[PDB]
Amino acid sequence: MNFNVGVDFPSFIAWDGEESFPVKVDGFNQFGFTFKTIAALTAATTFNIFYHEPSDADPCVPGPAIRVPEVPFCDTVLLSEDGLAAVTLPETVTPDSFCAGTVPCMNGQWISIAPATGSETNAANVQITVTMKGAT
Amino acid sequence: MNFNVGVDFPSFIAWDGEESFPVKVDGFNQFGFTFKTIAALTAATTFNIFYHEPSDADPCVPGPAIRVPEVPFCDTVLLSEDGLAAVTLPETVTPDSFCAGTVPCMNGQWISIAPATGSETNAANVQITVTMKGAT
């Protein structure tokens, strides 16, 4: 008796295993990620995070990719070496298992994910999607 | 103040544009699709729906590709042609579209999407994804 869960929290592709995608988060108030692998990974891989802005030419196409300034919450003991956000997948990630997280402070409108240097050879074996919650 | 919406409705790769993978719907009890186009399409694209079964070799690997039959959905004037469940995307659908649909009755452990004969070229412009409503 499954419902049409597409509408009312849809989702979109962000990292199809080959490139990024400027996913919109404007019309929705809450969002998050979901990581999914297809094979074993060689080492601890990591991904950065970028937020976009409505380009001045057309306020519908997202502008360039601006890195996001991650913020800590009464516990972060090791800051991420600067004011950036960077997700990393652990060593023992496995197929038929998914990890999921998000960033609390959204900036701009659009969101994209890019693998940091030294992990692009492994980023070909992972899937990253975004699912929203907001009506607006 | 977004939530970790990853848990509580994850999301996975349904159709990237060049192929499609089965998605597990065992632990989850409600699910649906989210259609999204990347560019202008030329003709109405029709997608065949399939379900898979646990291969007798290993209980958590999908078996072959079996096609789903469709429910008449009583309050309708259903004009099927062979009764095999499928869903198509209407013409003039922009990449700014919230196109979402679902199968009313699930019949297996894995769901998969494939493009039907005729909807081959423009099928590499469609971007399909699936969300869950899981439990258990």
Partner: peptide
Amino acid sequence: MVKLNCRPLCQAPTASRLVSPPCFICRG
């Protein structure tokens, strides 16, 4: 900072390989 909650999808193929002590008689 991203908090990665993660969770498996193939329930429990443990197969502990339960073993009992075999017929051990002495040390002579």
